[PDB]
Each structure stands twice: as structure tokens, then as C-alpha cells.
Amino acid sequence: ALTGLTVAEYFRDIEGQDVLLFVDNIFRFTQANSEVSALLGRIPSAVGYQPTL
């Protein structure tokens, strides 16, 4: 999702024009950080997620 934002932010900031940024399941970013954060040595937050959600 950050790569998609960087490709969009070059158009917004440098090129200076309207863009459309469609993201399919931005939930998967949060869920992937929840899968990563289980192993990074952290106490888990509410229903099982990362503390830095």
C-alpha cells in the first residue's frame, strides 16, 4: 500500500495533477502487520491485533 501511495504521490506532488487511487482491501495491510507483530516481541492489543494499529 505504501508503494501504491508512492507512485500516486509522485503524480500528486511532482507532476501536480488529479489522480485516482483505488486500493483493494486496505484491511490486508493491517492484518499483515498483525501477522508480523505477533513475532516482533510485542504484547498483543484488543481482539488479537498489534498495539500500534
Partner: protein, 141 residues
């Protein structure tokens, strides 16, 4: 704007900034309280302050509790809201009115932070989404 201060620790800002933003705004409003004037502090989404404090305390390896909130999350909101006082005449007689905003999930006031700040504050303006869509707006239950 000529009467309003706008303290904004936003979502990209770090969790200690969203933790210490209502204390910042309350200390700014305490200037008008302590000088005889009147203030109106509005802590918008005190629940998001509690979420930022939960992150900041879970990463400090402090043991979590109910909804993974720490023990002192009652004290977090109580020691902030009790700074909204109507001072006596020997201290200028100034005042401070606090308006904490709490977001609940499907009308559940039996949640942790919701029960804390309900028991802390004086009143409650309880708004419903089933009266909001019946045309009754402001949606005051």
C-alpha cells in the same frame, strides 16, 4: 478563531503526542480558568487518547487488562477531567467547562473507557444513530 485555540495531535502523529494533547489543551485552557475568565475545552475523541495511551503502555511492557487497556486508564481521564473547575471567588472566580467526546460501538456504553468517562463526568449527551436517521437531529436520546 479569535477566541479559539486548536490543539491537533492527528492520526499520523506519534502516540505520545495523541496521549499528551488533551493535557496540552487543558493546560492552555487553565490559563483562562486561572485568570478569572471562562474556558470551554473540548477533548474531541477522548477514546482515541485512550487508544494512543494503550499503545504507548503496551509497548512499554506494562501488563494489559480489560480490552488490553492498562490499569491507570481511569486515572488518565480522571486527572484530566477534574481540572475543569469553577474556581472560588478568592482565586478569580474563573471557570472551565469540559466536553469530552467518546465514540461507542453500536451504542455499547458497557465498554471500558465509556463506563470510565461516564462515571467521571457530570452529565452525558447521549446521541443515537437510530434517532439520527428518524430525522431527529441533534440526535439526543
Amino acid at each position: 478563531m479569535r477566541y479559539t485555540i486548536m490543539v491537533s495531535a492527528t492520526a499520523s502523529d506519534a502516540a505520545p503526542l495523541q496521549f499528551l494533547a488533551p493535557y496540552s489543551g487543558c493546560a492552555m485552557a487553565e490559563y483562562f480558568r486561572d485568570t478569572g475568565k471562562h474556558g470551554l475545552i473540548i477533548y474531541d475523541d477522548l477514546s482515541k487518547q485512550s487508544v494512543a495511551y494503550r499503545q504507548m503502555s503496551l509497548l512499554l511492557r506494562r501488563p494489559p487488562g480489560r480490552e488490553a487497556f492498562p490499569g491507570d486508564v481511569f486515572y488518565l481521564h480522571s486527572r484530566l477531567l477534574e481540572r475543569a473547575a469553577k474556581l472560588s471567588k478568592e482565586l478569580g472566580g474563573g471557570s472551565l467547562t469540559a466536553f469530552p467526546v467518546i465514540e461507542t460501538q453500536a451504542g455499547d456504553v458497557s465498554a471500558y473507557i465509556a463506563t470510565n468517562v461516564i462515571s467521571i463526568t457530570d452529565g452525558q449527551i447521549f446521541l443515537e444513530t437510530e434517532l439520527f436517521y428518524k430525522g431527529i437531529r441533534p440526535a439526543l436520546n
